[PDB]
Design an enzyme around this catalytic site. Structure first.
Site, mmCIF file in Angstrom:
data_model
loop_
_atom_site.group_PDB
_atom_site.id
_atom_site.type_symbol
_atom_site.label_atom_id
_atom_site.label_comp_id
_atom_site.label_asym_id
_atom_site.label_seq_id
_atom_site.Cartn_x
_atom_site.Cartn_y
_atom_site.Cartn_z
ATOM 1 N N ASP A 176 -9.705 -5.343 11.886
ATOM 2 C CA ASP A 176 -9.119 -4.177 11.235
ATOM 3 C C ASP A 176 -9.924 -2.910 11.497
ATOM 4 O O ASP A 176 -9.463 -2.015 12.213
ATOM 5 C CB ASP A 176 -8.993 -4.426 9.731
ATOM 6 C CG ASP A 176 -8.056 -3.448 9.057
ATOM 7 O OD1 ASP A 176 -6.870 -3.400 9.446
ATOM 8 O OD2 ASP A 176 -8.502 -2.731 8.139
ATOM 9 N N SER A 183 -0.022 -1.961 11.348
ATOM 10 C CA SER A 183 -0.055 -3.063 10.397
ATOM 11 C C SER A 183 1.071 -4.048 10.683
ATOM 12 O O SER A 183 2.209 -3.657 10.957
ATOM 13 C CB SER A 183 0.054 -2.532 8.967
ATOM 14 O OG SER A 183 -1.037 -1.682 8.657
ATOM 15 N N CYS A 194 1.394 -6.127 13.261
ATOM 16 C CA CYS A 194 1.798 -6.010 14.655
ATOM 17 C C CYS A 194 1.042 -6.930 15.604
ATOM 18 O O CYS A 194 1.410 -6.994 16.784
ATOM 19 C CB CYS A 194 1.645 -4.559 15.140
ATOM 20 S SG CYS A 194 2.837 -3.410 14.412
ATOM 21 N N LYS A 212 -9.906 0.620 3.368
ATOM 22 C CA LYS A 212 -9.079 1.689 3.917
ATOM 23 C C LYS A 212 -9.610 3.075 3.561
ATOM 24 O O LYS A 212 -9.817 3.909 4.447
ATOM 25 C CB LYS A 212 -7.636 1.540 3.427
ATOM 26 C CG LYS A 212 -6.935 0.284 3.918
ATOM 27 C CD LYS A 212 -6.773 0.295 5.430
ATOM 28 C CE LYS A 212 -6.015 -0.931 5.912
ATOM 29 N NZ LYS A 212 -5.855 -0.941 7.392
ATOM 30 N N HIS A 250 -8.806 2.156 13.634
ATOM 31 C CA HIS A 250 -8.105 0.995 13.091
ATOM 32 C C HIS A 250 -7.837 -0.003 14.218
ATOM 33 O O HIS A 250 -6.704 -0.233 14.643
ATOM 34 C CB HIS A 250 -6.813 1.438 12.405
ATOM 35 C CG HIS A 250 -6.050 0.322 11.765
ATOM 36 N ND1 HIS A 250 -4.687 0.376 11.563
ATOM 37 C CD2 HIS A 250 -6.455 -0.872 11.273
ATOM 38 C CE1 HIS A 250 -4.286 -0.739 10.980
ATOM 39 N NE2 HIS A 250 -5.339 -1.513 10.793
ATOM 40 N N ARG A 288 0.853 -1.182 0.000
ATOM 41 C CA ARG A 288 0.000 0.000 0.000
ATOM 42 C C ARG A 288 0.892 1.236 0.000
ATOM 43 O O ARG A 288 1.552 1.534 1.002
ATOM 44 C CB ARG A 288 -0.937 -0.016 1.206
ATOM 45 C CG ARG A 288 -1.747 1.254 1.398
ATOM 46 C CD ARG A 288 -2.718 1.107 2.559
ATOM 47 N NE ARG A 288 -2.091 0.467 3.710
ATOM 48 C CZ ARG A 288 -1.348 1.100 4.608
ATOM 49 N NH1 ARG A 288 -1.111 2.398 4.516
ATOM 50 N NH2 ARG A 288 -0.828 0.412 5.620
ATOM 51 N N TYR A 318 -4.009 -3.524 -5.452
ATOM 52 C CA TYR A 318 -3.655 -4.458 -4.387
ATOM 53 C C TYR A 318 -4.230 -3.955 -3.069
ATOM 54 O O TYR A 318 -3.943 -2.827 -2.656
ATOM 55 C CB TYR A 318 -2.135 -4.617 -4.286
ATOM 56 C CG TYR A 318 -1.681 -5.787 -3.442
ATOM 57 C CD1 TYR A 318 -1.555 -5.668 -2.065
ATOM 58 C CD2 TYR A 318 -1.367 -7.007 -4.026
ATOM 59 C CE1 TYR A 318 -1.137 -6.734 -1.291
ATOM 60 C CE2 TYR A 318 -0.948 -8.079 -3.260
ATOM 61 C CZ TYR A 318 -0.834 -7.937 -1.895
ATOM 62 O OH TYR A 318 -0.417 -9.001 -1.129
ATOM 63 N N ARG A 378 -1.242 -11.905 1.158
ATOM 64 C CA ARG A 378 -2.468 -11.884 1.939
ATOM 65 C C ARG A 378 -3.347 -13.073 1.574
ATOM 66 O O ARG A 378 -3.098 -13.792 0.603
ATOM 67 C CB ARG A 378 -3.244 -10.579 1.716
ATOM 68 C CG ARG A 378 -2.438 -9.317 1.968
ATOM 69 C CD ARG A 378 -2.499 -8.901 3.425
ATOM 70 N NE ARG A 378 -1.703 -7.706 3.676
ATOM 71 C CZ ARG A 378 -1.727 -7.012 4.805
ATOM 72 N NH1 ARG A 378 -2.513 -7.356 5.812
ATOM 73 N NH2 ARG A 378 -0.943 -5.945 4.926
HETATM 74 N N1 GDP Z 1 6.138 -12.606 19.166
HETATM 75 C C1 GDP Z 1 4.856 -12.470 18.750
HETATM 76 N N2 GDP Z 1 4.616 -12.331 17.420
HETATM 77 C C2 GDP Z 1 3.352 -12.191 16.949
HETATM 78 C C3 GDP Z 1 2.240 -12.193 17.911
HETATM 79 N N3 GDP Z 1 1.112 -12.041 17.192
HETATM 80 C C4 GDP Z 1 1.469 -11.949 15.885
HETATM 81 N N4 GDP Z 1 2.804 -12.042 15.740
HETATM 82 C C5 GDP Z 1 3.543 -11.981 14.454
HETATM 83 O O1 GDP Z 1 3.040 -10.923 13.636
HETATM 84 C C6 GDP Z 1 2.963 -11.347 12.274
HETATM 85 C C7 GDP Z 1 1.713 -10.785 11.617
HETATM 86 O O2 GDP Z 1 0.856 -10.233 12.611
HETATM 87 P P1 GDP Z 1 -0.679 -9.914 12.251
HETATM 88 O O3 GDP Z 1 -1.598 -10.339 13.371
HETATM 89 O O4 GDP Z 1 -1.072 -10.578 10.952
HETATM 90 O O5 GDP Z 1 -0.657 -8.313 12.099
HETATM 91 P P2 GDP Z 1 -1.979 -7.486 11.704
HETATM 92 O O6 GDP Z 1 -3.085 -8.431 11.302
HETATM 93 O O7 GDP Z 1 -1.640 -6.564 10.559
HETATM 94 O O8 GDP Z 1 -2.421 -6.658 12.887
HETATM 95 C C8 GDP Z 1 2.931 -12.865 12.282
HETATM 96 O O9 GDP Z 1 3.856 -13.379 11.319
HETATM 97 C C9 GDP Z 1 3.340 -13.277 13.682
HETATM 98 O O10 GDP Z 1 4.559 -14.024 13.634
HETATM 99 C C10 GDP Z 1 2.581 -12.348 19.345
HETATM 100 O O11 GDP Z 1 1.689 -12.359 20.223
HETATM 101 N N5 GDP Z 1 3.873 -12.477 19.672
HETATM 102 MN MN MN Z 2 -4.891 -7.942 9.746
HETATM 103 MN MN MN Z 3 -4.918 -2.856 8.980
#
Ligand code: GDP
Ligand code: MN
Ligand code: MN
Ligand code: MN
EC number: 4.1.1.32
Length: 620
Positions: free
Chosen positions: A309, A284, A286, A242, A262, A85, A233, A403
């Site tokens: 989200d 994002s 995280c 978004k 968000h 993005r 994308y 994704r």
């Molecule tokens: N160490 C750790 N890593 C995490 C945790 N939750 C998610 N991750 C990592 O963050 C990456 C993607 O996080 P995601 O939930 O998809 O982020 P979001 O959906 O954009 O908010 C994954 O590859 C995980 O390895 C956690 O509680 N601890």
């Molecule tokens: Mn997500």
């Molecule tokens: Mn997001």
């Protein structure tokens, strides 16, 4: 009503009828049809027959492939330059720059990119005129939120990419029934085009039509319009996610008096029989998706998912902050999703799911880094670059920002209120980001004002979501930096105003940090399922338990307050260590960021908390 048959596009409708469309809805279609000149016009109805016929076209055009190992799953490989993005090429069109971003002091405004109407009209007329030459224009009527429910908005997106039509059916409520609900009501005008009219002047990579040199995403809140061009994308093409549900929705929320954030929405139930709803604002990549679909490791606890989200909140007559998920599916990151980390996601993406930029196995399956799953003997892997891939090379088989697009109804732990029109009462808000050192595992704010300050002081290291690279700790207030719709100064005031509403039941505010490392590079907290141990402490604080301790930065759990049974080996001293040397520099960067970016539009209470925190830290 015309001299020559050059304005009546009735002879180009392959499905539907321009007569059945409302007045202002039809004018919006034929207006851009004359400008973009599409070969055909396809008014969507959202039926299964249309979706099945839409898949055959993309497959017969070399866009997507069929994943035979799963029930109705497809893979799509995009151009390597259109994978993220683009935040740098996103602008907001308002009359006064002060409405979009606070006028900075000396420095440049990170809280958004503003562009004038004159400069936008020059670039608009240099892209769209003739971009759909030889393509089909799909009319997509969707609805953000349950039909007929309060705070439910309807939009009309015109596009020439069937990959967008298929995804919009997964992420929103799109079909013919949306037109009957709209009638003669207002609707956000969306326009998307890949910018590759026929004949093609530039050979396409992976049959992915795009134009990176001319990519532009513009927003016009005064006109209720959204215009994107070049990309295709995620947030660039799915305008309802978004551009609509956050940027434009925030402007309307400020005018009408609600909130568009968000954040995720998850309900949690304890062994005693009580259930509460929480919200988490994470940047994002995280940890929002893994948290909303968590499989906790504590017996007697149950976590259900409502959203991952977007979150639209607003007070009710009784003084509660109710929230809803205006989306209809999931669009989360693929790499790192395994059975051990996010088992609920594995059960959902096994049918009626569209994958993008992930690796494909010989037997028709999917594969990506961190999947942690052995393959059968004799199975090969094909990377997202359409090449033969082996684990010995450096090229990753799946793109970092790859994704998956799956419907929300297929989730096993979907909350039985994710489509309720009234919403769920939120009793807690969680902030946090990727902070490798300094920030304790979890602490609690001291008041509503200090809570707003915590959200405004959010920082995190650059991940792999936008066009930022490296290990740089940048600012990201409320995880909304790339999605601010109007002045951030007025944004901080909109939150502080919630403390003035009568009979207001303000929720608690916490700050977490799963990514705090030690002096060797090892995470001090396992995370994922074990995060329920932290959420348990938040649940008790809401009921009013006495398990918190006062520190110069906030409330931290007292000793023997977190359920650490089964672990016991976690280094608790370094996981909750508040160093005076670290927080004296942290406030220094916070003081310089607020004065340079918010400047005159900074409320006094945000400044009073900055002085209060600085004072308490100096007394260590
Ligand atoms: N160490 C750790 N890593 C995490 C945790 N939750 C998610 N991750 C990592 O963050 C990456 C993607 O996080 P995601 O939930 O998809 O982020 P979001 O959906 O954009 O908010 C994954 O590859 C995980 O390895 C956690 O509680 N601890
Ligand atoms: Mn997500
Ligand atoms: Mn997001
Ligand atoms: Mn006040």
């Amino acid at each position: 009503p015309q001299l020559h048959n050059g304005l009546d596009f009735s002879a180009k409708v392959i499905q539907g009828s321009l007569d059945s469309l409302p007045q202002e809805v039809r004018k919006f279609v034929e207006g851009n049809a004359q400008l973009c000149q599409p070969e055909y016009i396809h008014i969507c109805d959202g039926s299964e027959e249309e979706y099945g016929r839409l898949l055959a076209h993309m497959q017969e055009e070399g866009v997507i492939r069929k994943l035979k190992k799963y029930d109705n799953c497809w893979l799509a490989l995009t151009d390597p330059r259109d994978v993220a993005r683009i935040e740098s090429k996103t602008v907001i069109i308002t009359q006064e720059q002060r409405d979009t971003v606070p006028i900075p002091k000396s420095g440049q405004s990170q809280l958004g990119r503003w562009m004038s109407e004159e400069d936008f009209e020059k670039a608009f007329n240099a892209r769209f005129p003739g971009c759909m030459k030889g393509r089909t224009m799909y009319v997509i009527p969707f609805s953000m939120g349950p039909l007929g429910s309060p705070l439910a908005k309807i939009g009309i997106e015109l596009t020439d990419s069937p990959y967008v039509v298929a995804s919009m059916r997964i992420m929103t409520r799109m079909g013919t029934s949306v037109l009957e609900a709209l009638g003669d009501g207002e609707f956000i005008k969306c326009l998307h085009s890949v910018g590759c009219p026929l004949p093609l002047k530039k050979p396409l990579v992976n049959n992915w039509a795009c134009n990176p040199e001319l990519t532009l995403i513009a927003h016009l809140p005064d006109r209720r319009e959204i215009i994107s061009f070049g990309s295709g994308y995620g947030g660039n093409s799915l305008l309802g996610k978004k551009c609509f549900a956050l940027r434009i929705a925030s402007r309307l929320a400020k005018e009408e008096g609600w909130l568009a954030e968000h954040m995720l929405i998850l309900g949690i139930t304890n062994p005693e029989g009580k259930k509460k709803y929480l919200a988490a604002a994470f940047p994002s990549a995280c940890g929002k998706t893994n948290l909303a679909m968590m499989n906790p490791t504590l017996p007697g606890w149950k976590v259900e998912c409502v959203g991952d989200d977007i979150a639209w909140m607003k007070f009710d007559a009784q003084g509660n902050l109710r929230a809803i998920n205006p989306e209809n599916g999931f669009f989360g990151v693929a790499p790192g999703t395994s059975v051990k980390t996010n088992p609920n996601a594995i059960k959902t993406i096994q049918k009626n799911t569209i994958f993008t930029n992930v690796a494909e196995t010989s037997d028709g399956g999917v594969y990506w880094e961190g999947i942690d799953e052995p393959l059968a003997p004799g199975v090969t892997i094909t990377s997202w670059k359409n090449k033969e891939w082996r684990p010995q090379d450096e090229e990753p088989c799946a793109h970092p920002n790859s994704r998956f697009c799956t419907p929300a109804s297929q989730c096993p732990i979907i909350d039985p209120a994710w489509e309720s029109p009234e919403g769920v009462p939120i009793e807690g808000i969680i902030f946090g980001g990727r902070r490798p050192a300094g920030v304790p595992l979890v602490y609690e704010a001291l008041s509503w004002q200090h809570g707003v300050f915590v959200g405004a002081a959010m920082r995190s290291e650059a991940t792999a979501a936008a066009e930022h690279k490296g290990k740089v700790i940048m600012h990201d207030p409320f995880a909304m930096r790339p999605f601010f719709g109007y002045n951030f100064g007025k944004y901080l005031a909109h939150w502080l105003s919630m403390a003035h509403r009568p009979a207001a039941k303000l929720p608690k505010i916490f700050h977490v940090n799963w990514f705090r490392k030690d002096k060797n590079g090892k995470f001090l907290w396992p995370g994922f399922g074990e995060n329920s141990r932290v959420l348990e402490w938040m649940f008790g604080r809401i009921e009013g338990e006495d398990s918190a301790k006062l520190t110069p930065i906030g409330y931290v759990p007292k000793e023997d307050a977190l359920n650490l049974k089964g672990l016991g080996d976690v280094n608790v001293e370094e996981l909750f260590g508040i160093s005076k040397e670290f927080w004296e520099k942290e406030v220094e960067e916070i003081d310089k960021y607020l004065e340079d970016q918010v400047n005159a539009d900074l409320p006094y209470e945000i400044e009073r908390e900055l002085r209060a925190l600085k004072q308490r830290i100096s007394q260590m």
